[PDB]
Amino acid sequence: DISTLPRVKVDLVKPPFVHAHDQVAKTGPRVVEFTMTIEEKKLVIDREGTEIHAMTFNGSVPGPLMVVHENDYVELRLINPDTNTLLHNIDFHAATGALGGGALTQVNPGEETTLRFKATKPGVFVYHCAPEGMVPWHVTSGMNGAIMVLPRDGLKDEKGQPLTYDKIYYVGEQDFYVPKDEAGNYKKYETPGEAYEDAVKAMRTLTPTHIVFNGAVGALTGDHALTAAVGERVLVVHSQANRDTRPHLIGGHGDYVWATGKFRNPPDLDQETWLIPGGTAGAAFYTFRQPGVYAYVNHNLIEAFELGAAGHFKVTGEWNDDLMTSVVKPASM
Amino acid sequence: DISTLPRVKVDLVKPPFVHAHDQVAKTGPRVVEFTMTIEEKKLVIDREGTEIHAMTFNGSVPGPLMVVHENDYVELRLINPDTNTLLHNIDFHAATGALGGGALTQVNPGEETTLRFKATKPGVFVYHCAPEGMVPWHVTSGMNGAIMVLPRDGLKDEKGQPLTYDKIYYVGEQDFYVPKDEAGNYKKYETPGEAYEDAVKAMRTLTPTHIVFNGAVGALTGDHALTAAVGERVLVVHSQANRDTRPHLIGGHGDYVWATGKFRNPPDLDQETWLIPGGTAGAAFYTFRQPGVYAYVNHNLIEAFELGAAGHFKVTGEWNDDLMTSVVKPASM
Amino acid sequence: DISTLPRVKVDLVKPPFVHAHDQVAKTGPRVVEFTMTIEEKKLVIDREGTEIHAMTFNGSVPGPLMVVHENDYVELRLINPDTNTLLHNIDFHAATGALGGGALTQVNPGEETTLRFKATKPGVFVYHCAPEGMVPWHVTSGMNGAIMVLPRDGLKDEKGQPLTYDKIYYVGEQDFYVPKDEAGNYKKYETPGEAYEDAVKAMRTLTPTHIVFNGAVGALTGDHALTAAVGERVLVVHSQANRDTRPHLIGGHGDYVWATGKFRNPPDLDQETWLIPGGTAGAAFYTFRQPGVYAYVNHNLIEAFELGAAGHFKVTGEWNDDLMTSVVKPASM
Ligand SMILES: [Cu+2]
Ligand SMILES: [Cu+2]
Ligand SMILES: [Cu+2]
Ligand SMILES: [Cu+2]
Ligand SMILES: [Cu+2]
Ligand SMILES: [Cu+2]
């Protein structure tokens, strides 16, 4: 009887941060309560000022990372305020049945719904909006995020030993398809209905105009760079709801990676770069060994440096000259 | 002496069905005899009525799934009737030598050949036509399928325990490159020779016009949806002879997946989505837990919902409200 | 004290060959000294005579394979002669800190630098140039290669048994983005500065004009085909610094594959085709069983046969009719 179980209300945070949780479950199974409010909003996604009509869970691209343990129940209150214009729903890749919940969570503006599902499989998973007939449009408008279902005894390495992270970040990578005119400039649209056919045309090119982390070019840079200290263990959860990516920590590695994100599998060790297929979340665990600026990218470097799929870590601490040093600094022949 | 071995004649079926076989070999090694007849034919591939000149093994896109056991011999009689206009051959990725058999199976219209190879490696494998100088043209005209080489003791999980499927389906995914004029409409062609240069141009865009399951948009929907019952164990073999895909069961998982299709490797567990590289067959084993309509897609959702890479399962049985339920149905604030 | 360690100078060779090394380390840790000289040069990359301004390490695309053992120190003298016009540097994916060395190795024409890093992780790894603000331009101009960090006790199979190769080759796969005019012909450029914007435009299409092995269409064919004998164990290291590939030995397999290239992981067995993500090196070990011509391809067959990603092996030895035979040669009905 699910009513006999503890209920715990989670208060979500904006990516790339992650709400408070315990790696190792400190209670038995729980009903873990989440509320997300759908927000359609304009977002500026690049340095040029390109503005799109984004479709968000909880106001962000990506939507927030939800965290539970295996065999918890996830109970989501999904709210579609009447300030929105479109119907939305949600497909949880962590869930079993009804198109991941999509068939049960169709909410018009001015409606809400509450879905519960049992999180039977441990891993990081994509969640995304998926309204019948307009699935890729919602997803590539930003309407996706991820959920992490931790093993009840936390993460393990390839030998069954504990892996415990000190910090966790969630990098949502978004492929956008801003319609272009024949000369190559972005078009603008008066209504979602008027935008739809040109959105479809743009999607069918299979060529994103923008590929961004945390909803915009440069979002995880400057004062919003990711941070860590030398010696800290960091888990980076990375999702891509629609298109393949290949994450890479420039200057580091994925010490332990679940590239397709499912923790009953042993991790791959020492990855330089890993492929997260579109429609998947993956997770990489790294212990920083060197201070300084790192760049965290999709290692299609065009996608990273021209289209936006690059963020930074600023790492504090001691430099280790045994691990790397400039023996002779750049100088003239 | 191969002549001392049993010979068994297989009678193939049209995808997504699979000819009768035993998971665990009930005999010693056999020469397993297959006949396929090449058919060049017009096919309508979308709802608009777009008609292409397809190149098929046995009249279907994909060609049929062939099933043997490890260390059986596959003996294929390949027939190219004089009603066809082109030369064809076959590359079995399961085979060793002579370009997978391609160098030994060049048949002009009005010819046939018989190839034998030993199936030394267990797995699902792509087979495809590959005539020197026109390889991608044949493959992206539909001229590919798959062969499953089962371990003699059937499939095993990651711990060495048996995995036994109740039902098997074969999903062949086809990237087509229908040539477009500058305005974006599909062109039509009088002869394969006249079509060739525009086919090459279209292929070189690396942007499929269509990506379909079982040879057409909607082929695995309606009365031709895949079926299962709650509690049934289903193996879905999925091939892509030319281009990456990322399969996903919307509402389910791959409980055990061999993403690159080779059964001497332990499967990956609990996959949401998995990458089958172009030129590969993969296999996913799932036990259904919920009834209803599922969609089985390439989770590049543009490729699925706009370009055609989507099919359905209709699953019968009991709904499990513990696993998923609508706590509060969509209703007004 | 690194000064107390042996120093060994390596003399590099041009791909696809690999400098002399020992699989199992015959000494303790060493400082392994490499020198590479940057060369900007014109290269003809196709049969049409298309000429690009390539950016190379040591005069080749790809740059040479460097080989060390785990816990050796790699000490690279990187020379940028004043005959070059651009600034360059190097990111070693094998290294930890300073953007893989990129932050420490910025050399203008007429400068050199020496970088040392400890090779703490075994695997094959990409190295590439990565100057701030022009990273994909350098990489997709050919300025990348690979480094293999062998386990000190050489390679192991999935059971911990030794795998010893008889021959090793390095296949560097390069995506080029030669700018096109609206009619589709390649443009030519007077200076790297004048070329830059059109290079960026071309890259942003995400559609390579050329995808080649060893720097040109047909480079690993004819008198420069790879060779082997029946019964020889061959390791093929394959890198792609910017874009996914899917290698396949036509007529063979990857008996043991580290698709993402890191040797602390067990290899995948019996691969037909494997995905090397862009920004990664992978390695495939195969024992040849049949003589003849093999084709080694990216199994996006358009990328292979139309865009250039195909090479050959010529294998000498005995044909095995048990493994494959033509039972009935192509003949008329
Ligand atoms: Cu939506
Ligand atoms: Cu989905
Ligand atoms: Cu053919
Ligand atoms: Cu092939
Ligand atoms: Cu450079
Ligand atoms: Cu890199």
Numbering used by the authors:
A (entry chain A), B (entry chain A), C (entry chain A): 8 to 340
Copy the relevant paper text:
Two residues, Asp98 (AspCAT) and His255 (HisCAT) in Achromobacter cycloclastes CuNiR (AcNiR) numbering, that are conserved in all CuNiRs and are located either side of the T2Cu, are required for enzymatic activity. AspCAT is hydrogen-bonded to the copper H2O ligand and also to HisCAT via an H2O bridge.
The T2Cu is ligated by a single, highly ordered water molecule (W1) bound in a distorted tetrahedral geometry relative to the histidine plane. The active-pocket residues HisCAT and Ile257 (IleCAT) were in similar positions; however, there were marked differences in the positioning of the AspCAT residue and its hydrogen-bonding network. In the SF-ROXOX structure the proximal conformation of the AspCAT side chain has two variants of the proximal conformation compared with a single proximal conformation in the synchrotron structure. The additional conformation is formed by a 34° rotation around the Oδ1 atom, with the carboxyl Oδ2 atom forming a hydrogen bond to W1 at 3 Å, while the Oδ2 atom of the original conformation makes two hydrogen bonds to two water molecules, W3 and W4, one of which, W3, subsequently hydrogen-bonds to the T2Cu-ligated W1. In contrast, our SF-ROX structure of as-isolated AcNiR reported here shows that the T2Cu is ligated to a water molecule. It is the first time that this catalytically important water has been observed in a crystallographic structure obtained using femtosecond pulses from an X-ray laser. The distorted proximal position of AspCAT seen only in our SF-ROX structure shortens the hydrogen bond between the Oδ2 atom of Asp98 and the T2Cu water ligand W1 from 3.5 to 3 Å.
